[PDB]
Amino acid sequence: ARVITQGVAPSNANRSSTKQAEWTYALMISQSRSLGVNCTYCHNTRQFASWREAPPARV
Amino acid sequence: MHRIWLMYDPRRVMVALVGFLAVLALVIHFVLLSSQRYSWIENGTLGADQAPVGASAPAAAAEMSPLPPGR
Amino acid sequence: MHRIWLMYDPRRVMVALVGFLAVLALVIHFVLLSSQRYSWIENGTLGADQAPVGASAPAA
Amino acid sequence: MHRIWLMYDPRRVMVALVGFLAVLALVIHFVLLSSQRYSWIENGTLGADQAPVGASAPAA
Amino acid sequence: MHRIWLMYDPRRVMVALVGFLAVLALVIHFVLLSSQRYSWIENGTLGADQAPVGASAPAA
Amino acid sequence: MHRIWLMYDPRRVMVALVGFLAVLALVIHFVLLSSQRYSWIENGTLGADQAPVGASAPAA
Amino acid sequence: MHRIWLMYDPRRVMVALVGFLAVLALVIHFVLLSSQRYSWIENGTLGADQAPVGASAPAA
Amino acid sequence: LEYQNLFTRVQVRTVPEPGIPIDESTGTRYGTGTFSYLAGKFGDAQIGPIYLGWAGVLSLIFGFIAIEIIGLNMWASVGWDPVEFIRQLPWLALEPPPPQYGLRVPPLNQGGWYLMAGFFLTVSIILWWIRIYRRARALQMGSHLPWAFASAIFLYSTFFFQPLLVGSWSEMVPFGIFPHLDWTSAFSIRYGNLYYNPFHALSIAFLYGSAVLFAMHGATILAVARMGGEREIEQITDRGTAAERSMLFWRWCMGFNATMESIHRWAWWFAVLTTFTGGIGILLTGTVVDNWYLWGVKHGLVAPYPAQNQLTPEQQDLLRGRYQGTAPDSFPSYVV
Amino acid sequence: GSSYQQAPITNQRRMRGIMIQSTLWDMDRKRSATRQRYYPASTPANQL
Amino acid sequence: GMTEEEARRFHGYMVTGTLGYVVVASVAHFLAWSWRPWF
Amino acid sequence: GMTEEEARRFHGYMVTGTLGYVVVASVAHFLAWSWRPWF
Amino acid sequence: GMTEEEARRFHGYMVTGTLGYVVVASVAHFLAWSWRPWF
Amino acid sequence: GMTEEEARRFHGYMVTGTLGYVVVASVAHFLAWSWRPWF
Amino acid sequence: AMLSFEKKYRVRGGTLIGGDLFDFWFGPFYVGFFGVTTIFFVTLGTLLCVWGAAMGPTWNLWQINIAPPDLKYGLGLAPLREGGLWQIITLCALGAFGSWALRQAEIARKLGMGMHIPWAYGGAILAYTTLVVIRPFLLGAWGHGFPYGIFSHLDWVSNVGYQYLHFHYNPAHMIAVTFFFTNCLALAMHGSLILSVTNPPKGTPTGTSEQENVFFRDLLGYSIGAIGIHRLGLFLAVGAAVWSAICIVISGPFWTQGWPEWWNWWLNLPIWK
Amino acid sequence: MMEYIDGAQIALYAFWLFFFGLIIYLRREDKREGYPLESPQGPRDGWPKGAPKKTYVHRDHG
Amino acid sequence: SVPVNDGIWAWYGIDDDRPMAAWSRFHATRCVEQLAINRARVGAAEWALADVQARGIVPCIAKAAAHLARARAELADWEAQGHRLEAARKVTPGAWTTPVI
Numbered sequence A: 001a002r003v004i005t006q007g008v009a010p011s012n013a014n015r016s017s018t019k020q021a022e023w024t025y026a027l028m029i030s031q032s033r034s035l036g037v038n039c040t041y042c043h044n045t046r047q048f049a050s051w052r053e054a055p056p057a058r059v
Numbered sequence B: 001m002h003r004i005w006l007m008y009d010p011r012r013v014m015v016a017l018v019g020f021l022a023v024l025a026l027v028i029h030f031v032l033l034s035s036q037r038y039s040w041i042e043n044g045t046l047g048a049d050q051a052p053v054g055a056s057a058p059a060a061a062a063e064m065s066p067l068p069p070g071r
Numbered sequence C, D, E, F, G: 001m002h003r004i005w006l007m008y009d010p011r012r013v014m015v016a017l018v019g020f021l022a023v024l025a026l027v028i029h030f031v032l033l034s035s036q037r038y039s040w041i042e043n044g045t046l047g048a049d050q051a052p053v054g055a056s057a058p059a060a
Numbered sequence H: 001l002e003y004q005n006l007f008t009r010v011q012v013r014t015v016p017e018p019g020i021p022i023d024e025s026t027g028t029r030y031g032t033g034t035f036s037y038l039a040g041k042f043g044d045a046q047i048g049p050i051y052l053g054w055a056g057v058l059s060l061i062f063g064f065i066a067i068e069i070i071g072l073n074m075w076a077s078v079g080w081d082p083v084e085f086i087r088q089l090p091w092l093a094l095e096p097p098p099p100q101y102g103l104r105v106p107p108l109n110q111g112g113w114y115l116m117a118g119f120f121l122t123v124s125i126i127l128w129w130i131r132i133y134r135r136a137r138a139l140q141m142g143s144h145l146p147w148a149f150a151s152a153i154f155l156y157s158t159f160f161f162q163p164l165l166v167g168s169w170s171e172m173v174p175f176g177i178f179p180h181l182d183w184t185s186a187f188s189i190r191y192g193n194l195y196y197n198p199f200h201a202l203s204i205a206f207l208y209g210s211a212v213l214f215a216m217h218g219a220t221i222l223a224v225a226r227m228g229g230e231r232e233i234e235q236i237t238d239r240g241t242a243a244e245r246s247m248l249f250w251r252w253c254m255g256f257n258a259t260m261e262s263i264h265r266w267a268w269w270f271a272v273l274t275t276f277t278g279g280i281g282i283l284l285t286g287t288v289v290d291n292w293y294l295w296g297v298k299h300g301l302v303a304p305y306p307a308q309n310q311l312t313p314e315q316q317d318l319l320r321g322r323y324q325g326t327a328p329d330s331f332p333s334y335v336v
Numbered sequence I: 001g002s003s004y005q006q007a008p009i010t011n012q013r014r015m016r017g018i019m020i021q022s023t024l025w026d027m028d029r030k031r032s033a034t035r036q037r038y039y040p041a042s043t044p045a046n047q048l
Numbered sequence J, K, L, M: 001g002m003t004e005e006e007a008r009r010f011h012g013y014m015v016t017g018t019l020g021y022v023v024v025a026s027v028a029h030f031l032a033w034s035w036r037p038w039f
Numbered sequence N: 001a002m003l004s005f006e007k008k009y010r011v012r013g014g015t016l017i018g019g020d021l022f023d024f025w026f027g028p029f030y031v032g033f034f035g036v037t038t039i040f041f042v043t044l045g046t047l048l049c050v051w052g053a054a055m056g057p058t059w060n061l062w063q064i065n066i067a068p069p070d071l072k073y074g075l076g077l078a079p080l081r082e083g084g085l086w087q088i089i090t091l092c093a094l095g096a097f098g099s100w101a102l103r104q105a106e107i108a109r110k111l112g113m114g115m116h117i118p119w120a121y122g123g124a125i126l127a128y129t130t131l132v133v134i135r136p137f138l139l140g141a142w143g144h145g146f147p148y149g150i151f152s153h154l155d156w157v158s159n160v161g162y163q164y165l166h167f168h169y170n171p172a173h174m175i176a177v178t179f180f181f182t183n184c185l186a187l188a189m190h191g192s193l194i195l196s197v198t199n200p201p202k203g204t205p206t207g208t209s210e211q212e213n214v215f216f217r218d219l220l221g222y223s224i225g226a227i228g229i230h231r232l233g234l235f236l237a238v239g240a241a242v243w244s245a246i247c248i249v250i251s252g253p254f255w256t257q258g259w260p261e262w263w264n265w266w267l268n269l270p271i272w273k
Numbered sequence O: 001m002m003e004y005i006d007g008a009q010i011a012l013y014a015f016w017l018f019f020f021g022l023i024i025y026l027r028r029e030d031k032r033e034g035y036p037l038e039s040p041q042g043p044r045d046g047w048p049k050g051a052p053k054k055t056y057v058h059r060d061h062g
Numbered sequence P: 001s002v003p004v005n006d007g008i009w010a011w012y013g014i015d016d017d018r019p020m021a022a023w024s025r026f027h028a029t030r031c032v033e034q035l036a037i038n039r040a041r042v043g044a045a046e047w048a049l050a051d052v053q054a055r056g057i058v059p060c061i062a063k064a065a066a067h068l069a070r071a072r073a074e075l076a077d078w079e080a081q082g083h084r085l086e087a088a089r090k091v092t093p094g095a096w097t098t099p100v101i
Ligand SMILES: CCCCCCCCCCCCCC(=O)OC[C@H](COP(=O)(O)OCC(O)COP(=O)(O)OC[C@@H](COC(=O)CCCCCCCCCCCCC)OC(=O)CCCCCCCCCCCCC)OC(=O)CCCCCCCCCCCCC
Pocket: B022, G011, G012, G014, G015, G016, G018, G019, G020, G022, G023, G024, G026, G027, H123, H126, H130, H133, H134
């Protein structure tokens, strides 16, 4: 489900579409509602990709 | 029938007509170019017996993928 | 019955009429082209015996 | 009865009528076209006994 | 009772009346069309015993 | 009593009243229609013993 | 035929024509350059027997 | 209680309504002036005749067909049901092509109508620009308005060029009320939080500054409208006490002032720079920078917070996922 | 995927918007609106 | 606006036009009911 | 605007124009019917 | 405005150009049809 | 505005310009066809 | 220094508080009592911001971050190094902004102007007060305020939005956005029109209100007129801030679910339920 | 191969140089009225020095 | 539309300009106010006509005469109300001691 690049510049490693980010966003709304929580329960939304900035519940 | 040009200014009708005809022409070419059977830029060299038929299904291709590789 | 043109300015009526017919013609062609049975640009060469029908396969 | 046309300008009424009937007629056709039973572009060639019917009694 | 038409312009009343009846009629038809029991375009051919009924008390 | 129709314009108060009753009646019907007990378009044919009742007090 | 220039000012029509031809030419080049068969900046040196061709009917 | 100039109690009407003054060729004024009492209570009353010319007429034909294609695809997507067309309207979309097509022409249902609607809309917008430009010249006015409108068109065009530069039409904005907001949010997700794009931050500063300025300037002119301050052209050519007092208010408040003319230059640039800096920020996204937060870490924008979690080395290998791939095109049985 | 198999037409969504399953369909459960989400069955006439 | 004679004249067309249209709609419903009855 | 004998002249063209259009559309339908009937 | 003489002159060119254009389009369809028929 | 003889002089260049453009486009199309035919 | 016409305007009077005591200028600036309180709060607040930077991890301008307290402190003052400093700076901010609006009222009264500018600024103060006073009070802890830091407050905006899953679906936010966008369009048209009549192409005479009116009427179909466009610009710019205040105060205190599921009422209208 | 310098940063300083140029231009335009300033030490111009006062050609008659 | 003088309150049926033959204190108050205004409005309209006749500008004289005639017609409408209220004031016991007109 990952779509975010782990570097500053664009690269062959990630060619995700904005449509694929829409699909992950759909999936994540489903998970949030399934628990009765919002995105900040598992993310710091300044970086959805980040694990260090996110609570342990993301693991 | 020529009295239609008294009722409408031909200088205005000619602009509306050229507009209508250009949009219609462009619509039909873009419609055909998006079809399987008539996408002549890619498949125009095919004979009439081997151009696609019946490709009317709405999801002929996958909706979700990465972009094509950067090379 | 031509006295309807005394009641309405034909110069406005013909613009309204032509405008209406063009949009109606466009809508109907788009509805048909969106259908399975009458998507004629892909399936126009099919005979009527093999054109799509909006029913499921028999014996359920 | 005709004195109703002294109360209202028939040029305004007859336009309002044509507008109403045109939109109403379109609505009805599209309400039918989007049903299962009257989706006549896909299924109009089905016989009346073959045409769909909505679900009925609730239990086995 | 006709004195009411001295108190009000009858052409204003007829416009307000006819518009009220039109909207009210449409609202009722769309309410019914959205219901299960009276979805008559899909299920109008069902007999009165076959037509849907909303859920009862459990009475278990 | 009747001198109130000197203090207020009859022609005007009647419109205000008739508009108020129209709004009140429609609100009450729509409140009932969205209940369970009185969703009469779906369940109106149920007998009074058989119609829904809101959940009771009994609890552990 | 020349009287068209009495009806339309050629200092307008010339500019409109040049603009139309510019955008049309740019569109057609862009459509071709985006295609597989005619992406000539990358594949222009391929011979005609080597250039891409779009699919076929899958007629066995 | 003091008269606030927010509402006009007494309008006046002229039996004739003003017409267009000059240059009637290649195009003509449609209609004739009429008065609106409500518009005449907000502002000036004449709902006017209107000008199109060749460019305006063609702009409407192209733009009508674009909107017609958008609406008919929306209506087809709920199966032509006219009740669902209204009920679901803000969720409906005409959607870009699938990503694996890149820049190739896609199938008609799968984004081929999208590109066609986008083409006619773009041509329509350019013809409307030509209309505005020609009309400014014909009224013997400066071209300040068409260059202001060109800045908006610049931002709009980046929603074509950035998808072109990343190489796929699938990255374009869907035509739809909520869908284009879904795209807007997902674009910031894909590219790693657009708040750290510095041209996005600049565009916001100019968007806010445009609201600051029109609030300040709108309030300033109403505060001196009791002295004819709203007759701004007269105040520019023949400075009255209304212009002097509005200059002194801002000088005494914040230590510097504009003039009655040059305040309109501040206004013009703040509006124009909103969409111009915005467009640059889009064009850099996915082409030069692919994760703006990491660009912000590199350049020192990102405030440090204490860690909320720490990964062990084997979790750093376990908790990496996969980049998202293709949807499954089969319905597996698990019977064996 | 190495190649694409097209789904049965009754499994193909009419709505191409990516998020509509979360933003609408998880709260909308009107029967007629539900039925419209997928293309209906479609068969060559000589196979009826 | 109109005279009483003009209203009288127009009303004859309007009533006849309306009832004519309703007659054509009646045949359309006859054809539709024969093809696929709704009750 | 329109004169009586100006309106009557215009009406003649409108009738033959309408009829000519309806004829072409009728041929268009019967041709489409022969190709792929909808009932 | 136009004179009727001027309108008649314009109508001659307009009808001729329209029918000429339709004839050219008729040939373009003959070529398209013989390349790849659509029915 | 142009006079009729001023217009008829302009028309001669316009036709020649159009013919020249179409000729260049024809040679371009024939080069393109010989390089990579589209039918 | 003074503008060439300024001196005759520099009279006494028009103050709300203090009378002649502070009724004087300092360079271009009018002082007044609310000038004195402005400088006090500005200075105290700014130096406490510098103190916040000093005890934080960096002097990098973009990264300085003076954060509110933990939610556990509720409506009390927290320890100063644990968010109590943010609370003291917030009081200075409220004092500085209020003093600024009242000083604007004194200036306007001295010039015989209407009170439009102070009240227009009140729209912005309302939004700030909503963000740091009203919404945190309704939620029961000052820690719901945003942090003072050029980019850390954007992290707060991001996270508050995603507390409601898809903040674009907030209906008051859609209105607020529409006002902000419509304001910027209207500002570009008003600026362009005045400049284009006052700065026509070389050798053209100066334009007129009639030309401006004609052109505008071809843009929108109707004449707004001179006072009308300034009413519109004020309505749009201040309405944007008021609807912003509404959109954030309903998020949390009144609506707690995701914003997309608020739209369920539209799907269930009885005509099409 | 420059690690720190990247196109987004280069663009941003390009903008800053334009923007500070623009503020100067606008502050020159803002001084076409009311300047030079009166002062007990004689005239003052501020900075930048203002553009000169415009004279406006009126519509010749109408 | 709302009438000018009762405005928003006309939505609630307060409408004191309407022709009233019974005695009513509210209509009497209104009529005394509107008589004074309309007498002054006639006085202004005939001053305006005299001024424009002195200037001799015929189309302005024509309009000023039309305006004066209209102003007189409105004053007569209020004087009719004043008299019919005067008739009622004499007989309805609770009514004012001061005349209405
Ligand atoms: C990269 C993204 C691009 C993406 C593509 C983006 C393209 C955007 C282009 C926008 C251009 C706007 C320019 C403009 O508005 O000028 C004002 C003028 C209206 O004013 P006017 O007063 O009414 O004009 C008539 C006349 O009075 C003007 O006289 P003036 O004295 O002012 O001079 C203006 C002329 C100068 O004259 C000429 O250039 C003509 C000379 C003809 C010589 C012929 C040769 C004979 C001698 C042989 C030797 C000759 C030796 C030379 O110039 C102009 O200002 C217009 C210049 C042409 C504009 C072309 C626009 C297309 C540009 C494409 C660029 C592609 C990219 C490179 O209007 C126009 O020019 C119209 C522009 C053309 C629009 C055509 C309509 C588009 C339809 C598209 C349909 C496409 C699908 C079929």
